[PDB]
C-alpha cells in the first residue's frame, strides 16, 4: 500500500524537525526498502545525510531522486546547498538556477541563491533574491535574518528599529521551539539580543557539530594525567584554519616560536593548506611540530592524530568562523580545551572548558554570557605582531610644507641614515621627531606624490610613494616582509584636509549602526572643520552613510571615504589621523591594535558583550585610561576635547607613541610568558582531579 512508504517518509520529516536525525535516517531508509523508486525519500534522506556531514552519499541520493523525477525542484535546490558546502559554487549556482527555472515560485531556492550572491560580494543581488523569497514565503526566518545582515553590511537602516524587533522575535520563537536560530553566532553581537539568547544561539550551532561526530561512533579518549611521557613538558596544540595570510597570523604568528621549550612542546594543527606566504613558513619553521590536518578531512581520523600526539591543552582559534572544524573539539581528544583569540565570543558548547580573556574584556559579573570558565591573562588577552611585522613605523619624520606630525610622513629602516646627510633637518622635541624643511629634497618628494610617481632615488636612498607598495614589493604590502625603502605617506594621497582634525575608523561598515553615526555626528558638529575618515567596505555602503549623516545635520564634505588597502598601507596610513573613533557596537579588534601601533589615540565606550569591550581592554594595557568612556556623553566629550585642545592632543598622541613600546600591549615575549603561566594553572588544576573552574588568579 502506497501509504506505507508515504507515512514513513512524512514521519521521518517530523523526526528531522524535532532534531532526531538518527531516527529520521532510519525511517527514510525503511521508506526506500518499501518503495525503492521513491524520489522524495531519496532527496529527504540526502538532506539529513548532508546534515551529518556525509556529503558524497547525499549527492548520490539527490541524483537518484532527480533521475526518478527530472523536474523535482526540491532535490535540485537541496543538492545546490550540498555543493555550496563542498565549495563547488558553480555547481551550486547551476542547481539553484535549474530549480528556479522549474518553479519560479520556489521561495527556498531563491533564498539559497541569495546566499551565493551574499558570499560573492554581490549584495544588491542577494537583497533582491532574499526579497523575492520573502514575497513568496512571508514567514521565512533564514531569508529575513540573512537579508537583515545584507542591510547591515551596506548600512541600510530603513526601518532599522522594526528590523531589530523582528530579528529578536524570530530568535525567541526559534529558541522556544527548539530550532536552530537563523541568526549566526558571529552576528548575534550586532543585534539587541539578550546575553541568554546569544549564548543559546552559540550552543545550538555547536550542537550541529555533534550530529557530524555522532555518526563516527567513537568512544571517549583516554587523556594524559601527568607529564612523564612528555619529559615534564606541557604539550599545547594550536588548532587553526588561519596559519597563513589571515589576520589571526598577523596577531599571533610569533607566539609558537616564543614558547619556552624547557617546559612546553608546541603542536600547530593547520586546518588549511599551505597558501605559500611567509606567515605559513614562519609557523611551520618555529613550532616544535606542525601538522597539516587539511590532508586529513575525516574529523575522527584528525582527532585520533591529535590524541596520538598526547596534547594536554588544545586551543580553539576558530570558534564560529570560516574554516572551523569544531567537530575536532567535540570529540575531546585533549583533557583541557580552551577558546583563544580567533573568535570574539562564547562557543556555548559543553566541549570547550575555558575561554582565554581578561578582567577588562570579561569582568566576573558578566560570566553568565559565556558557557566556558573564564581564564584571565594579566593585562589583555589581545596581542599583535606589529613590532615584528611593521618595525619601519617605530620612527617617523615629517616635511614642514609651511609643524604637524601627521600631514606629510616618512618612515623607513634606513630613514635615520638618510637624514644624517641632510644637514638642514630640525629635530623637534615632543620620541624625537625630525623635520625636513621645504628644501630641494622636500620639493622632489612632494612632486613624486603629486605626479603619482612610484619612487625616486636621493643620495642613493630609494624613496617610495606609499600608494605604490604592491608595485614595489608585494611581500612588503602584505606584511610578509619589512619594507626596505623610505616610504612617503600624506593626507593629500587620501583627500584629507591639511588644516583640520581627522577622526578615523577603518572597520567594516557593518560595525556601524544609526546610534554610532549619531554619536559621531554630535562630535563633528562640535569640532569645526573636522572630518570623519571611513573605508569603502563595501563601496555600495557609502551613499547610505552620506545620506544618514546629512539627515543628522552633517554636509557630505564632512565624511571622506578611502578604498580598502593592503595590510601595510592600512597600518601606515593610520599615522595621518589625529584620532580614531571606535565602534561601540562591536569594537575594532585587529584594527584597534593597528591604529595604536601608528600612535593614533582611540576613543572607545566598552559595552557588555566581549566584542564591545576589547578596545578598552587594549587601552587599559596600553596605559591610556583617559581614552575609555563610561557613557556616550563622555565618549563625545573626550573626542571633542582631543579635536579642540591641540596641546592636549599632542600630549595624548605622545602617550600612545611612547607606550606602544613601553607597555605590554605589543610585547609578544611577555605575552607568551604570561600565557604559559596560565596554561600551567589550568594543567595543575586538572592534574589535581578538578573539573574546570574560573582561573582569575
Amino acid at each position: 500500500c502506497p501509504t506505507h512508504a508515504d507515512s514513513l517518509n512524512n514521519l521521518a520529516n517530523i523526526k528531522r524537525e524535532q532534531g532526531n536525525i538518527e531516527e529520521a535516517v532510519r525511517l527514510y531508509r525503511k521508506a526506500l526498502e518499501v518503495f525503492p523508486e521513491f524520489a522524495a525519500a531519496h532527496s529527504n534522506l540526502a538532506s539529513v545525510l548532508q546534515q551529518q556531514g556525509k556529503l558524497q552519499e547525499a549527492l548520490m541520493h539527490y541524483k537518484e531522486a532527480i533521475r526518478i523525477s527530472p523536474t523535482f525542484a526540491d532535490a535540485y535546490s537541496n543538492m545546490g546547498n550540498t555543493l555550496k558546502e563542498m565549495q563547488d559554487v558553480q555547481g551550486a549556482l547551476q542547481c539553484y538556477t535549474r530549480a528556479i527555472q522549474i518553479n519560479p515560485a520556489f521561495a527556498d531556492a531563491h533564498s539559497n541563491l541569495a546566499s551565493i550572491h551574499k558570499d560573492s560580494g554581490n549584495i544588491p543581488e542577494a537583497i533582491a533574491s532574499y526579497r523575492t523569497a520573502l514575497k513568496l514565503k512571508p514567514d521565512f526566518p533564514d531569508a529575513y535574518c540573512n537579508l537583515a545582515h545584507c542591510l547591515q553590511i551596506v548600512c541600510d537602516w530603513t526601518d532599522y528599529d522594526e528590523r531589530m524587533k523582528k530579528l529578536v522575535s524570530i530568535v525567541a520563537d526559534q529558541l522556544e521551539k527548539n530550532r536552530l536560530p537563523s541568526v549566526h553566532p558571529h552576528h548575534s553581537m550586532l543585534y539587541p539580543l539578550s546575553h541568554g539568547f546569544r549564548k543559546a544561539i552559540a550552543e545550538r550551532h555547536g550542537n550541529l557539530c555533534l550530529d557530524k561526530i555522532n555518526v563516527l561512533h567513537k568512544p571517549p579518549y583516554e587523556h594524559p594525567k601527568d607529564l612523564k611521557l612528555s619529559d615534564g613538558r606541557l604539550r599545547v596544540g594550536y588548532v587553526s584554519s588561519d596559519f597563513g595570510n589571515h589576520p589571526t597570523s598577523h596577531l599571533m604568528q610569533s607566539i609558537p616560536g616564543m614558547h619556552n621549550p624547557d617546559k612546553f612542546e608546541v603542536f600547530c594543527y593547520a586546518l588549511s593548506p599551505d597558501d605559500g606566504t611567509n606567515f605559513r613558513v614562519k609557523v611551520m619553521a618555529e613550532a616544535n611540530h606542525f601538522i597539516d590536518l587539511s590532508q586529513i578531512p575525516c574529523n575522527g581520523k584528525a582527532a585520533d592524530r591529535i590524541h596520538q600526539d598526547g596534547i594536554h591543552i588544545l586551543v580553539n582559534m576558530n570558534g564560529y568562523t570560516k574554516g572551523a572544524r569544531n567537530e575536532l573539539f567535540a570529540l575531546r581528544p585533549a583533557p583541557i580545551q580552551a577558546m583563544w583569540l580567533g573568535y570574539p565570543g562564547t562557543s556555548g558548547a559543553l566541549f570547550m572548558d575555558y575561554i582565554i580573556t581578561d578582567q577588562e574584556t570579561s569582568p566576573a559579573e558578566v560570566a553568565e554570557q559565556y558557557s566556558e570558565k573564564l581564564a584571565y591573562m594579566p593585562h589583555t588577552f589581545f596581542i599583535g605582531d606589529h613590532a615584528n611585522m611593521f618595525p619601519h613605523l617605530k620612527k617617523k619624520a615629517v616635511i614642514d610644507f609651511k609643524i604637524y606630525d601627521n600631514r606629510i610622513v616618512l618612515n623607513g629602516i634606513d630613514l635615520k641614515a638618510f637624514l644624517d646627510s641632510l644637514p638642514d633637518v630640525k629635530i623637534v622635541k615632543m620620541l624625537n621627531m625630525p623635520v625636513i624643511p621645504m628644501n630641494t629634497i622636500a620639493e622632489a618628494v612632494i612632486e613624486m606624490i603629486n605626479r603619482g610617481q612610484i619612487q625616486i632615488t636621493i643620495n642613493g636612498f630609494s624613496i617610495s610613494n606609499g600608494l605604490a607598495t604592491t608595485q614595489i614589493n608585494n611581500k612588503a604590502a602584505t606584511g610578509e616582509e619589512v619594507p626596505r625603502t623610505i616610504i612617503v605617506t600624506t593626507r593629500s594621497q587620501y583627500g584629507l584636509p591639511e588644516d583640520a582634525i581627522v577622526y578615523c575608523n577603518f572597520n567594516q561598515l557593518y560595525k556601524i549602526d544609526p546610534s554610532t553615526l549619531q554619536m559621531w555626528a554630535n562630535i563633528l558638529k562640535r569640532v569645526p572643520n573636522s572630518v570623519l575618515w571611513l573605508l569603502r567596505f563595501p563601496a555600495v555602503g557609502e551613499p547610505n552613510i552620506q545620506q544618514y549623516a546629512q539627515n543628522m545635520g552633517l554636509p557630505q564634505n564632512r565624511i571622506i571615504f578611502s578604498p580598502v588597502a593592503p595590510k601595510e598601507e592600512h597600518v601606515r596610513r593610520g599615522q595621518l589621523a589625529d584620532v580614531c573613533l571606535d565602534t561601540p557596537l562591536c569594537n575594532g579588534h585587529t584594527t584597534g591594535m593597528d591604529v595604536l601601533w601608528a600612535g593614533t589615540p582611540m576613543v572607545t565606550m566598552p559595552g557588555e558583550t566581549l566584542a564591545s569591550r576589547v578596545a578598552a581592554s587594549q587601552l587599559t594595557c596600553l596605559g591610556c585610561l583617559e581614552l575609555i568612556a563610561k557613557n556616550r556623553q563622555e565618549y563625545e566629550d573626550i573626542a571633542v576635547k582631543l579635536g579642540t585642545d591641540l596641546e592636549y592632543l599632542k600630549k595624548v598622541r605622545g602617550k600612545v607613541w611612547k607606550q606602544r613600546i613601553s607597555s605590554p600591549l605589543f610585547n609578544t615575549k611577555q605575552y607568551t610568558m604570561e600565557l604559559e603561566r596560565l596554561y600551567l594553572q589550568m594543567w595543575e588544576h586538572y592534574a589535581a582531579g578538578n573539573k574546570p573552574d574560573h582561573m582569575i588568579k
Binding site: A5, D6, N9, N10, N13, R16, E17, F38, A40, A41, S43, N44, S47, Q50, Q51, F72, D74, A75, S77, N78, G80, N81, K84, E85, D108, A109, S111, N112, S115, K118, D119, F140, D142, A143, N146, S182, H184, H186, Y320, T321, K322, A324
Partner: peptide, 14 residues
C-alpha cells in the same frame, strides 16, 4: 568571513 547558511526543503509525500 563564514559562508552564509542555506535552507534545506523537506518534501511531503502524497
Amino acid at each position: 568571513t563564514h559562508e552564509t547558511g542555506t535552507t534545506n526543503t523537506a518534501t511531503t509525500a502524497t
